[PDB]
Amino acid sequence: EMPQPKTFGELKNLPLLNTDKPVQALMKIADELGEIFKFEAPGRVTRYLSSQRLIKEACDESRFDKNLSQALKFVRDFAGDGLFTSWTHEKNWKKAHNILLPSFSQQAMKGYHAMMVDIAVQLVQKWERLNADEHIEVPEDMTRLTLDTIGLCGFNYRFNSFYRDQPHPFITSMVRALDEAMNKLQRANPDDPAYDENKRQFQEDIKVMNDLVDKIIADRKASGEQSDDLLTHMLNGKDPETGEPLDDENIRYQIITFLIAGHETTSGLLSFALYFLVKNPHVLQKAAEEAARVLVDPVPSYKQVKQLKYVGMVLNEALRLWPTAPAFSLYAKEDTVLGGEYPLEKGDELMVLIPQLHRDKTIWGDDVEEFRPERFENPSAIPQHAFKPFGNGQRACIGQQFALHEATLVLGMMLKHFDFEDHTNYELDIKETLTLKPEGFVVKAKSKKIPL
Amino acid sequence: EMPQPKTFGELKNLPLLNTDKPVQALMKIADELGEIFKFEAPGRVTRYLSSQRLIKEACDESRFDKNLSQALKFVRDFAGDGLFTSWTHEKNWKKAHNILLPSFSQQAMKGYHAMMVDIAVQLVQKWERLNADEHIEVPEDMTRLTLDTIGLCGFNYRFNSFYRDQPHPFITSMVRALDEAMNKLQRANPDDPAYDENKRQFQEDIKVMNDLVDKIIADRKASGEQSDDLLTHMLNGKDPETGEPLDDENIRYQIITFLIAGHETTSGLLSFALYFLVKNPHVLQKAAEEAARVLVDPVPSYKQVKQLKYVGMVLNEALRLWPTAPAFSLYAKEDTVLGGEYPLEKGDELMVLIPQLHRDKTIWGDDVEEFRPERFENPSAIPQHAFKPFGNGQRACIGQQFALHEATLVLGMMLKHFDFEDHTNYELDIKETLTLKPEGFVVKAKSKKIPL
Ligand code: HEM
Ligand code: HEM
Ligand SMILES: CCCCCCCCCCCCCCCC(=O)N[C@@H](CCO)C(=O)O
Ligand SMILES: CCCCCCCCCCCCCCCC(=O)N[C@@H](CCO)C(=O)O
């Protein structure tokens, strides 16, 4: 009854993941097979969902809970029972959720604004200081900005990424760890000795990330300054339910979790948004007119960023086409029938293929490939479970407002301060590291010569 | 130091309550004066609190206990030492609390469900049987439903409100008693002979309510049916702490208390929720889609009502904007400093202005007047003591789960069975009877023709 892509004998569908672009491969399979398909590997099965019709059922928290995909099981080798890679039923999930949600309160967000501006001004100064006909490496600079922003706002720690021509060592190790997790998805026999070098390199990259976590904890312990940031809540906050704080082992996992989850996908978002703006110059002009009208002061105020409505619509439309954490996994809490057609047993898994949900013509209309921010004129018009770049329910993204405030601030400043040229007529090439990001995307930025 | 609204010479602030909308007047004063203001009358003072930062301190049960506001001292003339109008230190408060808490257990709620459906089906049948272009009197029908539900579930007594074109006589007397309590708030000389007719009518209304209580007790005493409801617990239950049952005098006060507290505010909630739904059609679409997807049987089950997450979020957002028991009062157990700024002496009174707490932009963001159920999509994101429609601590609403189960069931069935039209473009007009409810709110309901 359920469609299934092509098989490879006893390897079933597993060789379909032998690609550097597995999510894009699964999107093409969804276009061929429709709203649901079965995906089998030796010893495993999951079902990929692409329609709002089925995903609205998958998002019913009475029926389905967050599952760890194979990807997240591999990421858990370094992120442990941090928020992203914990099961809902592990005591540390609800404890850390309750302890860290206050770090994303409206008061906390206003508190982060000045440090977001510190890093955004470093980006604008970098681009102001370029010589004639020099270009910008877009995803590279967006990763400099977003890593520095979570480091400073979250941990009062300066990665100083704009002082480096090479990616930050933490980034080199994170990307190689994410790429190893993604490459491991196709491995039939991961304990074959052919993967011993992969395992060694993975452990080395995990140690690089943990050495930096050690430095952040040591810097806070040695600090004479009074901080009130995400790390303050990790070290001091008590869960109202249990009355307990986090232990040291869980805090280390939360720091690695927030450094990764708290920047990589925001770098992707900013990169895709600038891509779509240079490919749609009338949209760029509309966004630049709003930035010039609203951002009347040398640096943006908190309230001014909240008033960048069209910049927000541009970011939402970029998340519609290329949600940068492009899937999430669920399991059936109990036996249930999906869509009146597909009986599931307790424990059966689903994968939500977010880029395909976001191309559901029954929700968005036939023009789903067009970049049209005006779809989000009134975001309330979008049905439940139709636009899900931040996941679902109590396991939804804790950082959504942080990410959108940062991205809106930075894109607003970029559009205020520069005109942009797609000088190479760049062909979109989406690199996969579990997360999605344009690769090789370069532009030229001509200063409007507006002082900071 | 403390702000204070305008004065009337020796009457101080008392004539500010000479209005049929005193809570709405106090909300406007809070908007003008901010998080705290003094309110003086001849011989008394209280302080109105509107900010989460001060209300979280007021909600510290080590520092403050429930006070009887002037409103509750007047209601105590008929509700005595029932749960709502008892002091925490009166023996009958903890005794009745321990005897009746089990009547609001999950097991009790599953037991009430069928009788809630009996009344909900009567509402749906009434609206199905209307002719073309007839309309619904919303608060009137919600009062028919909620009074009948507490009567049947609580006391196995049928008010038969859907058999009446006029309000039930118990409602006429209750509303006139609550209106008298509210009107008495402004009286500098309550024993002036000008109020002799007010006093006579108040006593008549109290007698109507007590005659109905007599009938309920007599009907149970004469019954050949074995009930296990709220009245069973009042008449037979022993407090585990003292080992004592309630005496006859306290039982009479509890029955009056539960008939009033157990329906009026739920009628308000349902009326405000339907108001917000017809004013926010995208929210109505989301709630109606959930009702259709979840309520797959002609008779909703207990489990299906628990599954209506979005309907629950609608109800919580209605309670955010218009909490239908809109204030509660506290006194200082000992000398203490509120908010590091306002010294209080033992016995000093506070009023918590719940609608203003719920508009605290430091908690909710600047868009506080917008109806957005999605504020409640991630429950732990609501800060401690930011959302208090059911009061605080051991003196919180005993009936919260009953009210929300009833309202979720009924609103779910309404949205399953009908489309709604705001055919008059109704202008919100909030009637005050201590409690709040829309007045004159009418809609048209077009049947979806789904059988019961
Ligand atoms: C545009 C940027 C972002 C996107 C697209 C994004 C996307 C997501 C998605 C889809 C999930 C759900 C994962 C699943 O169910 O497996 C998630 C969870 C999470 N995200 Fe984000 N995220 C972004 C930014 C952020 C930021 C900036 C932070 C931190 C400051 C953050 C922290 C987290 C955490 C901790 C979780 C786990 C929450 C839980 O289950 O308790 N994310 N994110
Ligand atoms: C949406 C509906 C309701 C709202 C907004 C509401 C609100 C409240 C509030 C604010 C208080 C505390 C007042 C104070 O501190 O002076 C309270 C107390 C109380 N409520 Fe409710 N109520 C609702 C429904 C119900 C129902 C359905 C019942 C009974 C079935 C009920 C029974 C009581 C009782 C008995 C108390 C006194 C509790 C005691 O202090 O021990 N309420 N309610
Ligand atoms: C520590 C913080 C974590 C940040 C990592 C975020 C990663 C977000 C994206 C995860 C989804 C990527 C899915 C990859 C494609 C896929 O469909 N995988 C399935 C393959 C079926 O086995 C799986 O992992 O079973
Ligand atoms: C028996 C069951 C009880 C039903 C009663 C529910 C009523 C709940 C709402 C009570 C709050 C009404 C506040 C009225 C406005 C106000 O602020 N009153 C102050 C005025 C200052 O004296 C007061 O009563 O001092």
Q: From B98, B125, B114, B138, select the one nearest B405 (Cα to Cα).
A: B114
Query: β-strands B64-67, B327-332: how paired?
Result: antiparallel
Q: Cα–Cα distance between A58 and A42 in angstroms, integer?
A: 25
Q: For chain B, how many residues are written?
A: 452
CA R_g for chain B: 22
Q: Cα–Cα distance between B118 and B183 in angstroms, integer?
A: 37
CB count within 10 Å of CB A339 equals 14
Output the six-digit token pair for A184.
Answer: 């491991």
**Contact with chain A for residue B365, Cβ under 8 A:** yes
With 0-12 CB in 10 A as exposed, 13-18 as middle and 19+ as buried, what is B426? middle
A contacts of B310 (beta carbons < 8 Å): 384
Q: Residue B153 C-alpha to ligand 2 middle, in angstroms?
A: 17
Instruction: Tally DSSP H helices, then E strands, for chain B.
Output: 17, 12
Q: Is A209 in the pocket of ligand 3 (CB under 6 A)?
A: no
> How far, CA to CA in Å, does B434 sit from each of B71, B174, B188, B431?
7, 12, 19, 9
CB B73, CB B87: distance < 8 Å: no
Residue whose token pair is 């011989």: B43
Pocket of ligand 1 (CB under 6 A): A 66, 83-84, 97, 150, 257-258, 261-262, 265-266, 269, 323-325, 328, 389-391, 395, 397-399, 402-403
Q: Cα–Cα distance between B407 and B271 in angstroms, integer?
A: 10
Q: Three-state DSSP class for A18?
A: coil
What are the φ and ψ backbone dihedral angles of A339, each rounded to 5 degrees? Answer: 70, 20
Output the six-digit token pair for B293.
Answer: 């997807």
What are the φ and ψ backbone dihedral angles of B375, each rounded to 5 degrees? Answer: -55, -30
Q: Cα–Cα distance between A325 and A185 in angstroms, integer?
A: 16
Residue whose token pair is 């370069």: A442
Q: Cα–Cα distance between B7 and B42 in angstroms, integer?
A: 12
Q: Three-state DSSP class for A284?
A: helix
User: In sequence order, what are the residues at sequence separation of 6 or more whose Cβ sits closer than 8 angstroms to the Cβ of residue B307?
Assistant: A60, A62, B294
Name the active-site residue from A46, A153, A155, A397: A397
> How far, CA to CA in Å, does A136 sit from each of A115, A163, A165, A269?
23, 15, 12, 16
* Residue in A closest to B363 by C-alpha: A106
Beta bridge partners of A329: A67, A351
Q: Cα–Cα distance between B197 and A52 in angstroms, integer?
A: 63
* Residue in B closest to A382 by C-alpha: B282
Beta bridge partners of A343: A337
Q: From A73, A150, A163, A182, select the one nearest A122 (Cα to Cα).
A: A163
Beta bridge partners of B327: B353
- To the query of whether residue A265 is one of the catalytic residues in this protein, the response is yes
Q: Three-state DSSP class for B87?
A: coil
Beta bridge partners of B48: B37, B351
Q: From A236, A229, A312, A315, select the one nearest A268 (Cα to Cα).
A: A315
Q: Cα–Cα distance between B143 and B140 in angstroms, integer?
A: 5
Q: Is B328 in the pocket of ligand 2 (CB under 6 A)?
A: yes
Report the alpha-carbon angle B216-B221-B227, nearest 5.
80
Q: Cα–Cα distance between B383 and B393 in angstroms, integer?
A: 16
Atom 15 of ligand 1, nearest CA residue: A328
Q: Cα–Cα distance between B1 and B34 in angstroms, integer?
A: 13
Q: Cα–Cα distance between A371 and B320 in angstroms, integer?
A: 37
Output the six-digit token pair for B169.
Answer: 């006589």
Q: Three-state DSSP class for A398?
A: coil
Strands (E) located in A179-314: none
User: What order of strands is seen across the sheet that includes strand A349-353?
Assistant: A36-41, A44-49, A349-353, A327-332, A64-67
Using CB atoms, pick whichever of B310, B372, B380 lies closest to residue A97. Answer: B380
Query: β-strands B36-41, B342-344: how paired?
Result: unpaired
What are the φ and ψ backbone dihedral angles of B337, each rounded to 5 degrees? Answer: -105, 120
Q: Which helix (H) or strand (E) holds B142?
A: helix B138-155
Q: Which helix (H) or strand (E) holds A232?
A: helix A230-236
Q: Cα–Cα distance between A136 and A110 in angstroms, integer?
A: 30
Q: Residue B8 C-alpha to ligand 4 middle, in angstroms?
A: 22
Ligand nearest to the CA of B262: 2
Atom 42 of ligand 2, nearest CA residue: B399
Output the six-digit token pair for A432.
Answer: 């996969």
User: In sequence order, what are the residues at sequence separation of 6 or more whose Cβ sits closer than 8 angstroms to the Cβ of residue A399?
Assistant: A104, A258, A261, A262
Q: Residue A288 C-alpha to ligand 1 middle, in angstroms?
A: 28
Q: From B324, B270, B358, B272, select the one nearest B435 (Cα to Cα).
A: B324
Q: From B329, B263, B318, select the one nearest B430 (Cα to Cα).
A: B318
B91, amino acid identity: K
Q: Cα–Cα distance between A133 and A444 in angstroms, integer?
A: 7
CB count within 10 Å of CB A333 equals 15
Q: Cα–Cα distance between B181 and B31 in angstroms, integer?
A: 25
A contact test, residue of B285, B378, B382, B384 with most A CBs within 10 A: B378
B contacts of A52 (beta carbons < 8 Å): none
Q: Cα–Cα distance between B374 and B387 in angstroms, integer?
A: 15
Strands (E) located in B74-171: 136-137
Q: Cα–Cα distance between B128 and B135 in angstroms, integer?
A: 11
Q: Cα–Cα distance between A318 and A371 in angstroms, integer?
A: 8
Query: β-strands B349-353, B44-49: how paired?
Result: parallel
Q: Region of A447 please: left (phi>0), alpha (psi -120 to 50) or beta.
A: beta
Three state DSSP letters for B232-270? HHHHHCECCCCCCECCHHHHHHHHHHHHHHCCHHHHHHH
Exposure b/e, B371-401, CB count within 10 A at least 16 = b: bbbebbbbebbbbebbbbbbbbeebebbbeb
CB A123, CB A145: distance < 8 Å: yes
Q: Cα–Cα distance between A408 and A411 in angstroms, integer?
A: 5
B108, amino acid identity: A
Contact B377 A383 (CB under 8 A): no
A contacts of B312 (beta carbons < 8 Å): none
User: Long-range CB contacts (< 8 A, 24+ apart) of B77-80?
Assistant: B77/B202, B77/B206, B78/B177, B78/B206, B78/B209, B78/B210, B78/B256, B79/B253, B79/B256, B79/B257, B79/B260, B80/B249, B80/B250, B80/B252, B80/B253, B80/B256
A contacts of B282 (beta carbons < 8 Å): 378, 380-381
- To the query of whether residue B265 is one of the catalytic residues in this protein, the response is yes
CB B289, CB B432: distance < 8 Å: no
Q: Is B39 in the pocket of ligand 4 (CB under 6 A)?
A: yes
Q: Is B97 in the pocket of ligand 2 (CB under 6 A)?
A: yes
Q: From A53, A59, A48, select the one nearest A25 (Cα to Cα).
A: A48
What are the φ and ψ backbone dihedral angles of B240, each rounded to 5 degrees? Answer: -60, -30
A450, amino acid identity: I
Q: From A96, A71, A80, A92, select the one nearest A329 (Cα to Cα).
A: A71
Q: Is A398 in the pocket of ligand 3 (CB under 6 A)?
A: no
Q: Is B79 in the pocket of ligand 4 (CB under 6 A)?
A: yes
Name the active-site residue from A257, A265, A266, A433: A265
Q: Three-state DSSP class for A421?
A: strand
CB A74, CB A190: distance < 8 Å: no
B contacts of A94 (beta carbons < 8 Å): 380
Q: How far apart are the first and last CA of chain A?
A: 62
Q: Cα–Cα distance between A352 and A325 in angstroms, integer?
A: 11
A66 CA closest ligand 1 atom index: 15
Q: Cα–Cα distance between A410 and A271 in angstroms, integer?
A: 11
User: In sequence order, what are the residues at sequence separation of 6 or more whose Cβ sits closer than 8 angstroms to the Cβ of residue B131?
Assistant: none
Using CB atoms, pick whichever of A57, A101, A378 lies closest to residue B381. Answer: A101
> How far, CA to CA in Å, does B179 sit from each of B261, B306, B431?
15, 35, 10
Ligand nearest to the CA of A350: 3
Query: β-strands A36-41, A44-49: how paired?
Result: antiparallel
What are the φ and ψ backbone dihedral angles of B85, each rounded to 5 degrees? Answer: -115, 15
Instruction: Return the domain boundaries, chain A.
Output: 1-452
Output the six-digit token pair for A138.
Answer: 């877009």
Q: Is B327 in the pocket of ligand 4 (CB under 6 A)?
A: yes
- To the query of whether residue B59 is one of the catalytic residues in this protein, the response is no
Q: Three-state DSSP class for B41?
A: strand
CB count within 10 Å of CB B427 equals 7
Beta bridge partners of B45: B40
CB B63, CB B73: distance < 8 Å: no
DSSP string, A118-158: HHHHHHHHHHHTPPTT--EEHHHHHHHHHHHHHHHHHHS--
How far, in whole angstroms, is CA A359 from its chain's centroid?
19
Name the active-site residue from B84, B155, B397, B441: B397
